[PDB]
Symmetry: D2
Subunit: 501 residues, 4 copies
């Protein structure tokens, strides 16, 4: 069977060979990138069901990112299959500074009183922790006594007891035993540090990705619709209006402003990593189910992210909790599941994609029994959406092997996908940008074909493409929708039930 | 407002003028039928909402019946509207004989002991009641002691206490006070008197009707599939294969064998008059709701009959119970409601059809709130049925003014009607027999058009005929289904949502 | 097996014997009332399932009404069973006057122009119909050009085309052929003739009935809460606070103000006879279902009335539409069904009550499958209501033969009845006025017992009363509720499931 | 709020202090157990919401197990709170043999051909792996070609490609790069190695636990009902009939025989660790949801086990997939969640129990919205179960703070728990064995109280104990059930709604 749930795989050195050396091996970083050998490894990830690669601009300079994007373009040719390109922004990250010395880290013990500096471009000491704040902002007047400075995946807590106006330093109490290492993530929950709607470094990263050729931007730490619309204006003004924007929800402001963020964006990445530090970790499952429902109801794409097969970074088998998490993300209604370090940096990138594909394919078989999404509740808000509802009805009434839509922009395919039919969706489109642009919608198999003339039989074309793709065989029943005829129809207006010859 | 629930109106002398005289006036029967004046009265019933006329062969000879059927054909020309023609068989009727002397009736009291004669071709006396049994059957060995002989709409009960082998007479006890009049209906419940599957009189009646031109036969007292199959054989062998058969369910065997009868017939007439004598009267509403559900599930036609506006036989207003009965039959899911003496014999035939139409129209507006049928529960058992389900879905998703089907045989219109869409159904068909044969399906407006060729745009035809009929205006949304293209499609395979120009 | 739906039977001369003569026989009103003979006939209606008798003060003087009420008290002793006493007011009736000089009626044809006079105390002529308006009100200023004057159960329409200020006469045109007879009902729909909130004639009839001993008042033509509250004030003033008020809903204003009327009243009588003249007849079934739902959700009593078995006034069997109407009133959720002329004036009063009881008992068995009422949707607004919901739950979980409630005021029985449990409700109460006041609540069997002391076993009392009433036998499971213990409990606070010894 | 989902915490050296050393400090095992210091750590796990401690007899001899149980009895005194004692059996085990020349492990590469010996009492070589099978059984005739030998938590796969009848050796191909170390766990999925229903080692370990005093036994690798019944016979024979048996379902045979095992057991432990090696890993979520539903429908206890907070063994915070897993186990309907190495052997035992309790408490607030279990579907199979349903109804109708049951054996408390009321359940019981035996039922707070006397007010006692436990305050509404009168009632037969003073 075809895997309806889409996989986003983050790329990094794990798949990359450097003069015959694998990531980890001594001298690895001293060798030149073997592009063909790296492209062949990426090809296997595509074959195992990666539908989109994530280029995380938090790690690796423009040269590294651009070389990896080029390597994927070769892998597509090797695999015989296209994938989406997704750029993930750095955004308003706060990290611990480098320490004085060749000190890489210091261990602390509960109750121990230390300070954190707000002055930028200075090194840390054991007793005065400095921060690398995005854009070198001064955060002193934005964090109150009683606020928490969390270091490294929220592992070490520092309680702001007092503030020293003389040095612009936070006096903090170590809440629990743990280490402060250099260049680790810092979270300061329930604060509104005035990060700009779009920082110059993200502006620059996005413009670089847009020049290379991308299909999706995942915008880190979206707080408001303005954070999405600043990125949209770049995409539009550079001639890249086709690029789709996924707002990453990972803090309380993003949760509070979710409805306006969904309205501005093409989709949501549930960024559970930061989210579970910024809000109570036990609320993340609540927010996940609610986000997936609301995004599906808006006919947009939802990606569930972070830790999904975390153990497979270092070990060959996923835990039972990881398998349950992937499975339940599908039942919740996610369009897509994501890998981060598992595919980018781990010992088992191919096995991670394969394992996620196996779970995702099994979970899709239970959506009839257990799925949370309920298409019967939707308002049908347009005639294309009325047709999408009729398609879902036909797939419920009888055994339909495949829904085919002839779609110029993918709008019809997006609306069919919204309704989660009991069938794969072959989206026949007429340009490569629309084709790749569909690769994260649940159930959709995008395929490039010639735009039909007013003299072509679009129903015979649908059947022939489905056969050429190996998706159907003689005696299978398919549902085909189209705008008929070409030049008269203003939208998808026809549904045909056809038996394959 | 189109009336979706269909009306069967029994014709009789009430609408018929004879040498300037209306029914009721002395010497009426001594004058000859005024055909033109009578056709003008019938055209008013057609205009008021009568969709089919019932010719009851229990009353009036082949001359009365044939002249009435000719008079309707003129009425259709006057109204500019066609109607269905339904023959209702006499069947295995038992009536009281004429009395010796010139006695018209005797009155009896609870406990009196009299006899019922089984000998055919004699006259009744006060003490020995003679029966006129269909086909002159001897019923003596077919009714046990403890059975009941009911005279005149079940009003007087006679208990069989003993049988006189010498005279072949039932000794009976009068069960309640009442009258035995001449030529009154007799019922003997929970007996299996071996009336033939098809009596010669019903054979001859049906053959006469088939010659005149009928669309429907309602078969009285259907007990088994064989009672229906014997009539089907005559229709087939006379080249009247198009004629549709309604089994009348009006005794316990009909109820017991209901599934096999529904399988053999095209529809059911719920013949509540006899039914509520032959079975406990308080079970009739239970059987009504059950039969409507079952016949609708089978994709067949159900007619609810008898006493629906009974008071309007004598009075110009129906009782509160009559209006409630018509309203509730629609809510239960009936395709059609019927009038017997109200339209045939009463003082207010036109007002009876008008009153029924007004109630049926109001009740159809409450089918979304109160409607008992549930199309969501059906197995979609064919590709045409899957398309019918998708049409229903489209009419639930958005405001659809009309569904149009291009239907050679009516099959697509019957399956759309089964699903009870929130829309009228325009059934475009290519012969008059198919057209009239759709006149009792819920919501169907049959309309004759030229068979489309492979060069015709069936979707433009649909819009044109709907605009011509005055059913849609500019801006209305319609659903159109057809088998496209003509000569290649083996069935209805296409649905279009179209805005009227 | 127990009849849960209650029957209100209207009393009159039909059951009354006079010097050995039955109603309709020659010199009937010549003879004196045989009280003992008449009381034996009424006891048979009690035994057949009449739960309350209606005394219609629209007909017969105080002496006739008081004697009839005395006859019922004897009938209760003969039957060994108590019934409720219900007074139905005259209210604001309009009747046609006597005609000039002994004359009875005239016939009229469509388009004919006559007058109706508003002056009170004068006789009609054929040309000038006079009205007997309740309280001799002058209606001339309260009826607009464009209204209709309907005579005799709405059968003849008179359109008001002009008004003659000189004579205070309506110039009317006959809308349809028909008859104006002396002393027939007149309706003038959608008018607000300023009938007082309480007329003197109704005050005097209500104070009379209260002096005789009644349990219920059904207030004709209720328009607002004020019409109910005026009668409440009489009941309060006279120490008859226990008397329950049923608003009769029978015009558009009553329908428009239904919510505030239900609030003010103890219940609603759906007075379909006048309603179906004052509003479009085809709307009565919609309003009937809606009123039953709203009154039940309020925890109050609804009576469905008028024409339920109308044919049985004159014939020994009801029509199929009459049986359907009674059956469907039960399915709709009525607490009670009513007989008017069928029990008061017809030839078959006993058969009418028996027939209604048979239908009501069969319909109650189909409430699980078809019942319109939905107790799952109610807000449980008090702890007694939560206990009523839990009782319903227990009767759905297992086979419960009987629910018993020990109730001082009947509150707990009313709430249990509201929930329509799958069981009869035995209401053990401690005074006859409470007992009689429960006789129209669905499923409630009221029974008089001593008030339990702090020392009594109320669960043993419940079982003993149920066994002595013949409602349960050994091995039956019952649900008993009570306020335990007496003296400490402030409401019904206990549910016990008990197996009968 | 009170935590309704129960926590099973496995005990081990993580919480144990030995001469002032914590587990993993140098010379830990050289110091003797500090019983007080260990009991103080254990008391903190109780206070954090551990409801039952698991004593895993797979690791540690009788002396270590008995000393650990004594330390828990002191911890209960420190906490002022009791916990359940659960014995987990060693059960059938296969382990890799020691290697010749005291070698520790060998590395192997995908595609290598090696051998597996079935001959017992023999050492492994790199080329010929030998197995230590429980009872030294000969495996050869139980394993067919196409089966797998999986080594070390299923990390290394060996496909059986051929068998050699002369050496009784399996020819295996290495399926992935990995290590075969000495004395590691081996799984052979989908085989029926004839391990005894109850091995002597398990028989002896169970008798030791029963003599120490336990409340639960979890039976490892239950394959059929006989594996439960053999343990039940030992509980019955030794006078320990109160001990409850949880079948561990962890292989294909246990799943195939689930219905008969649920019938024999008191509950199920979903042993996901072994299950996800023994069945396709992607099927575990399917089986988990199905087992929870079936065990709850049977009125029995289900524990979801293994890897729930696995990362917390080494790190102070759980992953997003782990929090999701715990949350979703609650939504699926689990009675209890379990910790293994997280509480027994990790760095953060107290943090692991606190985190699991935080997640379980948040998830229970979403059971109304998202809960999978459907109590409306259950057949109520006894009168106690009817009362449990009524209790649920009361908690759905109004805001109920607490359900109190006075329960002699816990049966009523088990049935209320089965229905998952919107309330905590205080189970007032009269002996410590019944008390401890309720500690894993969802929502049940067991509390030892004096048996009520014939003159006691059990409803007053319920209120008093609820206030004593701190579960209610003034104005709260509670539901109380009991068998009334005490001792004479055959079962719980009474429900009261009471307002707390
Ligand atoms: O029916 P809707 O939602 O208004 O959408 C109609 C729009 O869809 C489009 O058909 C695009 O649809 P496709 O890209 O699927 O062909 C536009 O041409 C049209 O304006
Ligand atoms: O889809 P189903 O139920 O098998 O029906 C197919 C049959 O219907 C027909 O199309 C008739 O349909 P119409 O009469 O509505 O045109 C036949 O040609 C065909 O064999
Ligand atoms: K990032
Ligand atoms: K009255
Ligand atoms: K174990
Ligand atoms: Mg009235």
């Amino acid at each position: 069977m075809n895997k309806r749930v889409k996989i986003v795989a983050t790329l990094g050195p794990a798949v990359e060979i450097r003069g015959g050396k694998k990531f980890g091996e001594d001298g690895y970083w001293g060798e030149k990138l073997d592009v063909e050998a790296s492209a062949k490894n990426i090809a296997k990830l595509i074959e195992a069901g990666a539908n989109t690669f994530r280029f995380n601009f938090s790690h690796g300079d423009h040269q590294e990112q651009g070389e990896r994007m080029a390597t994927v373009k070769l892998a597509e040719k090797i695999a015989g299959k296209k994938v989406g390109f997704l750029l993930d922004t750095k955004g308003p990250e706060i990290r611990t500074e480098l320490f004085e010395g060749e000190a890489k880290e210091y261990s602390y013990k509960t109750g121990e009183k230390i300070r954190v500096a707000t002055k930028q471009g200075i090194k840390s000491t054991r007793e005065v922790i400095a921060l690398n704040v995005a854009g070198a902002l001064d955060i002193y007047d934005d964090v109150e006594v009683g606020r928490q400075v969390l270091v490294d995946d929220g592992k070490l807590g520092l309680r702001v007891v007092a503030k020293d106006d003389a040095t612009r330093e936070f006096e903090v109490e170590v809440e629990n035993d743990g280490i402060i290492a250099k260049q680790k993530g810092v979270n300061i929950p329930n604060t509104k540090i005035p990060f700009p709607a779009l920082a110059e470094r993200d502006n620059d990263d996005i413009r670089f990705g847009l020049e290379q050729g991308i299909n999706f931007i995942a915008i880190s730490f979206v707080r408001t619709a303005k954070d999405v619309n600043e990125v949209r204006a770049i995409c539009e003004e550079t001639g890249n209006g086709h690029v789709q924007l996924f707002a990453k929800i990972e803090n309380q402001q993003g949760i509070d402003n979710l409805d306006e963020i969904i309205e501005a964006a093409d989709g949501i990445m549930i960024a559970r990593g930061d989210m579970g530090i910024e809000v109570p970790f036990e609320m993340v499952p609540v927010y996940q189910k609610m986000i997936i429902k609301k995004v599906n109801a808006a006919g947009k794409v939802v990606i569930t992210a972070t830790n999904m097969l975390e153990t497979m970074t270092e070990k060959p088998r996923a835990t039972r909790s990881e398998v349950s998490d992937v499975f339940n993300a599908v039942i919740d209604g996610t369009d897509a599941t994501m890998l981060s370090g598992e595919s980018a940096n781990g010992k088992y990138p191919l096995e991670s994609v394969t394992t996620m594909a196996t779970i995702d394919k099994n979970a899709q078989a239970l959506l009839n029994e257990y799925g949370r999404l309920d298409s019967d509740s939707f308002e049908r808000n347009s005639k294309t959406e009325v047709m999408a509802s009729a398609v879902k009805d036909a797939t419920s009434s009888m055994d339909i092997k495949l829904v085919v839509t002839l779609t110029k922009t993918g709008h019809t395919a997006r609306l069919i996908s919204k309704y989660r039919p009991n069938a794969d969706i072959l989206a026949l489109t007429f340009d490569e940008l629309t084709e790749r642009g569909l690769m994260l919608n649940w159930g959709v198999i995008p395929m490039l074909t010639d735009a039909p003339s007013s003299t072509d039989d679009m129903f015979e074309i649908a059947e022939r493409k489905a056969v050429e793709a190996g998706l159907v065989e003689s005696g299978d029943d398919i549902v085909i929708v189209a705008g008929v005829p070409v030049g008269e129809a203003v939208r998808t207006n026809t549904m045909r039930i056809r038996t394959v010859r």
